[PDB]
Tab-separated table of C-alpha atoms in Angstrom:
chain	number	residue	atom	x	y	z
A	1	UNK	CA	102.810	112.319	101.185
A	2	UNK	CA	99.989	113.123	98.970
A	3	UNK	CA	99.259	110.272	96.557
A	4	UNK	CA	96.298	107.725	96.551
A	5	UNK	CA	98.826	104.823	98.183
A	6	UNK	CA	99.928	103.777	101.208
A	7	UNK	CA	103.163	104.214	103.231
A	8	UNK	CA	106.958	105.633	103.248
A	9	UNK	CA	105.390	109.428	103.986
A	10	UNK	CA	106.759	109.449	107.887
A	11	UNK	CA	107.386	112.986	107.337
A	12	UNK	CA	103.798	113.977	107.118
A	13	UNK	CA	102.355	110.468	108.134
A	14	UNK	CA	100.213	110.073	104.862
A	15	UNK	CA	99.866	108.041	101.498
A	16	UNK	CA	103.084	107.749	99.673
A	17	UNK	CA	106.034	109.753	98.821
A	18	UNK	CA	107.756	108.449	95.293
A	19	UNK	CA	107.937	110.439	92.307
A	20	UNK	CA	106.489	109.324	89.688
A	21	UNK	CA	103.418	110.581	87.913
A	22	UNK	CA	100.705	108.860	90.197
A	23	UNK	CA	103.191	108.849	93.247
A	24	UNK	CA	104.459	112.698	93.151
């Protein structure tokens, strides 16, 4: 998803997908 990480996103194939606020 679309966060400045890495990982989990295999939805959308991007970085990071955990809510949170610097991972929403």
């Amino acid at each position: 998803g679309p966060t400045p990480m890495v990982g989990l996103d295999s939805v959308s194939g991007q970085y990071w997908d955990q809510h949170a606020p610097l991972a929403d």
